[PDB]
Amino acid sequence: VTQVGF
Amino acid sequence: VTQVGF
Amino acid sequence: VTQVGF
Amino acid sequence: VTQVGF
Amino acid sequence: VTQVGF
Amino acid sequence: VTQVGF
Amino acid sequence: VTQVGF
Amino acid sequence: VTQVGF
Amino acid sequence: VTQVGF
Amino acid sequence: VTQVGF
Amino acid sequence: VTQVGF
Amino acid sequence: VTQVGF
Amino acid sequence: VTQVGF
Amino acid sequence: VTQVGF
Amino acid sequence: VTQVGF
Amino acid sequence: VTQVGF
Amino acid sequence: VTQVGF
Amino acid sequence: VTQVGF
């Protein structure tokens, strides 16, 4: 699980 | 941004 | 952006 | 954008 | 955009 | 399952 | 499951 | 940005 | 599960 | 930014 | 920024 | 589990 | 910044 | 578990 | 900054 | 568990 | 457990 | 357990 939020 | 991963 | 992954 | 994947 | 995939 | 939305 | 939303 | 991963 | 949102 | 991972 | 990891 | 938020 | 890790 | 928030 | 680790 | 917040 | 906050 | 806060 990899999550990138911006 | 809302992220839910499992 | 709403993301749900499983 | 709403994404649901399983 | 609404995406549901399973 | 690959989802791309923009 | 890969989700890209923007 | 809210991220929940497990 | 990879999630990218922006 | 709120992150919960387990 | 709130981070909880376990 | 990797979470990046900004 | 609040961090809880265990 | 790696969390980066800023 | 509040940090609790165990 | 690695947490970086700023 | 490594926590860096600033 | 390493904690750095500033």
Residue numbers in the entry:
A (entry chain B), B (entry chain A), C (entry chain A), D (entry chain A), E (entry chain A), F (entry chain B), ...: 1 to 6
What did the published study say regarding this structure?
The first and the last repeats (R1 and R5) form amyloid fibrils in isolation and are critical to CsgA seeding and nucleation by CsgB, while the other repeats (R2-R4) contain 'gatekeeper' residues that temper the amyloidogenicity of CsgA.
The β-strands were oriented parallel to each other along the β-sheets. These three structures are class 1 steric zippers, as defined by Sawaya and Eisenberg according to the organization of the β-strands and β-sheets. In each of these dry interfaces, the chemical properties governing fibril stability, i.e., buried surface area and shape complementarity between sheets, resembled those of eukaryotic steric zipper structures. Specifically, the R1 45LNIYQY50 and 47IYQYGG52 segments and the R5 137VTQVGF142 segment formed fibrils that bound the amyloid indicator dye ThT and formed canonical amyloid class 1 steric zippers. These segments contain Gln49 or Gln139 (marked in bold in 45LNIYQY50, 47IYQYGG52, and 137VTQVGF142), which are critical for fibrillation and cannot be mutated to asparagine without interfering with curli assembly. The R1 segment 45LNIYQY50 and the R5 segment 137VTQVGF142 also induced fibrillation of Aβ1–40.
